[PDB]
């Protein structure tokens, strides 16, 4: 399978993608690119680095002035988060690895919604009180997940940060936290002392926490982590973190382990996750309301005593409602204890932050079909009554496959997108009529049709007529496509006229 699709290769690696107002924004090393939605042509670029950072040089100003090199270090600016806000005047909000993890806001001029250079504001207020706090230090260079949400008429950021112990009295980052933007737009605020839950300094180095994904649902906020099973355990697992969606602080904070298995082969390391509604057929199969949010997560086996993915993959689905039932009804005390890395192990306590002991289990929905492969990306969408997943591998391979408990399915779309691993940062857009996903691989991003690609595989009318029926392929005068893409009045699944 070889296809030519709308694509874009950046000057550097791409970290994040965001779709706004029919323009595509790329968070990449040292650049933010603005692409056209139609053809993915570059409309503009914004140079974010490299920047010269230093002890003396201060956040949210250029010290290129005194690039004197007294102690100057050039650093590439990796995009850690990229957010659009339309609650305040439309803005792109971008946070990079350098300058204490501060964010910058690019305010679009009234008629030019692709201009991120005219008005750029660096978000920073000097900590007013006598404070060791840095609400403006948002994002960690080790890895961060930013979930943005409007609540109570404020823009709130929920953030997951991987941390070490190389940190300051100012410039402390938090593992997990909620903070809000000030209406003045010149800074962020932690509301209470419970707005952040941090790994004890004592463990910051030995207990890394990676944040795979984050989402809202059911009035709750959810993060997905990878981390050690225990403070001093040599093994790793995936956890789902739940807390109340409030800005005043993190409430009802609970962590829960997630086992994805195959039938007892544990796939203990989540690679990518996507939450969406289930198609009709699948909903019935899994006891869901067409209404219900489903967490689809591709898991991988780790090498012994490691968090390194081993090239064996599974995909388990977790109905939020299902997940919630376990969070909501404690059952055995034996399964619950004080959050081990937040309080110590020997805390008096051992609000009250909690972790579960046993893992919540699901069963590979692809029936071991991806055991010899490493899935690195996943998005999910409905087509008619079907649920379809868009998978990517460590090898640059892209697949579309139908999701069902009733039998396995060979992907109806499967091809090599690139040499580079498929990025987990994906976008799904439903142009009502039709739809595409944006998939990243290295420095390239590709625009893939959600539906008609199965057909484009067939080069001739004959091949096209002998396509498997569920793809709904047909011949429009010189090409194989689904009914809806035929502008030559006449589309056929029955007749090939003379060549």
């Amino acid at each position, epitope marked *: 399978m070889k296809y030519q699709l709308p694509n874009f290769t950046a000057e550097t690696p791409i970290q994040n993608v965001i779709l706004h107002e029919h323009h595509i924004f790329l968070g990449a090393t040292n650049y933010i690119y603005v692409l056209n939605e139609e053809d993915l042509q570059k409309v503009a670029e914004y140079k974010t680095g490299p920047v010269l950072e230093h002890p003396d040089c201060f956040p949210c100003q250029d010290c290129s002035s005194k690039a004197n090199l007294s102690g100057g270090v050039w650093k590439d600016n990796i995009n850690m988060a990229l957010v659009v806000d339309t609650y305040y005047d439309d803005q792109l909000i971008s946070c990079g690895s350098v300058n204490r993890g501060t964010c910058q806001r690019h305010v679009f001029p009234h008629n030019h919604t692709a201009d991120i250079q005219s008005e750029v504001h660096c978000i920073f207020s000097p900590q007013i009180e006598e404070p060791s706090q840095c609400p403006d230090c948002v994002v960690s260079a080790l890895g961060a997940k930013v979930l943005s949400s409007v609540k109570d008429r404020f823009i709130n950021f929920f953030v997951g940060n991987t941390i070490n112990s190389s940190y300051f009295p100012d410039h402390p980052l938090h593992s997990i936290s909620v903070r809000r933007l000030k209406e003045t737009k010149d800074g962020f605020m932690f509301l209470t002392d419970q707005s952040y839950i941090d790994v004890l300094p004592e463990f910051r180095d030995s207990y890394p926490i990676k944040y795979v994904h984050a989402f809202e649902s059911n009035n709750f906020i959810y993060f997905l982590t990878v981390q050690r099973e225990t403070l001093d355990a040599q093994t790793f697992h995936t956890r789902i973190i739940r807390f109340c969606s409030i800005n005043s602080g993190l409430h009802s904070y609970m962590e829960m382990p997630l086992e994805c298995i195959l039938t007892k082969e544990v796939f203990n390391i989540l690679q990518a996750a996507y939450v969406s509604k289930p*198609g*009709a*057929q699948l*909903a*019935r*199969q899994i*006891g869901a*309301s*067409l*209404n*219900d949010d489903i967490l689809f997560g591709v898991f991988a086996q780790s090498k012994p005593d490691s968090a390194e993915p081993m090239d064996r993959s599974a995909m388990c689905a977790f109905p939020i409602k*299902y997940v919630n039932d376990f969070f909501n009804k404690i059952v055995n005390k034996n399964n619950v204890r004080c959050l081990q890395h937040f309080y110590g192990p020997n805390h008096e306590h051992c609000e009250y932050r909690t972790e579960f002991t046993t893992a919540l289990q699901r*069963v590979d929905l692809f029936m071991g079909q991806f055991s010899e492969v490493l899935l690195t990306s996943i998005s999910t969408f*409905i*087509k*008619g*009554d079907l649920t379809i997943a868009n998978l990517g591998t460590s090898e640059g391979r892209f697949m579309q496959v139908v999701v069902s*408990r*009733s039998g396995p399915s060979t992907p109806h779309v499967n091809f090599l997108l690139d040499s580079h691993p498929v990025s987990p940062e994906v976008i799904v857009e439903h142009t009502l009529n039709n739809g595409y996903t944006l998939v990243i691989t290295g420095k390239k991003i590709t625009k893939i049709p959600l539906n008609g690609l199965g057909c484009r595989h067939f080069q001739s009318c004959s091949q096209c007529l002998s396509a498997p029926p569920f793809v709904q392929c047909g011949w429009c005068h010189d090409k194989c496509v689904r009914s809806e893409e035929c502008l030559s009045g006449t589309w056929t699944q029955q007749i090939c006229l003379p060549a």
Partner: antibody
Amino acid sequence: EVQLVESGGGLVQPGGSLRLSCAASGYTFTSYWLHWVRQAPGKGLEWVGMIDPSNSDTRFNPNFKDRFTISADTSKNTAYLQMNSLRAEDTAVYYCATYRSYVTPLDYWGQGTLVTVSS
Amino acid sequence: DIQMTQSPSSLSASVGDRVTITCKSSQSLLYTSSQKNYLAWYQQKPGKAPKLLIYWASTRESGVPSRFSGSGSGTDFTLTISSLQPEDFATYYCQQYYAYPWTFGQGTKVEIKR
């Protein structure tokens, strides 16, 4: 032909517990959710819950989430509705049910047993 | 819940008459991807399981006499029974199976004038 038969109906004190049986035949038991519905004499229909025989997953009308339980035995192609802290308004006819596919709600039903919660 | 409101609770009509039962839901039962409404109509004879008449709002089930017809979209649905027959005395229930818990309408008692 799909066939569903309830059992265990009868008289039960308020406060007490009762286990209803639903033995199924004529389809792959593990491939369909097994639903329970009830109806108080001369009243409307109320949906109780359902279990997935393949893994024993459950879904309950928020009303019975606390007091009710559903179990299954794959070897017996039978589902059990377990009720506790039964009270007057639980006196009703209890049907078990299932469907042909995702296109329909319930296609097949039992005869229903009568549960009377009295002293 | 999703609340189901049937109207009327009772009606008494003659053999051969067109009867109309109404069913309103508190939110859309429309599944947009296939453009199907997840609403169904049951018929219940005394001391009997409910029998499925119509599913997806307007699709008549196999066997069901031609005179039963569903219609409506979104929040408003209608079960019509033209040419009412004597064996049609029963209680008709609209049910949504769009989300859990599944919910029925109060049911409409249908009696035959004669």
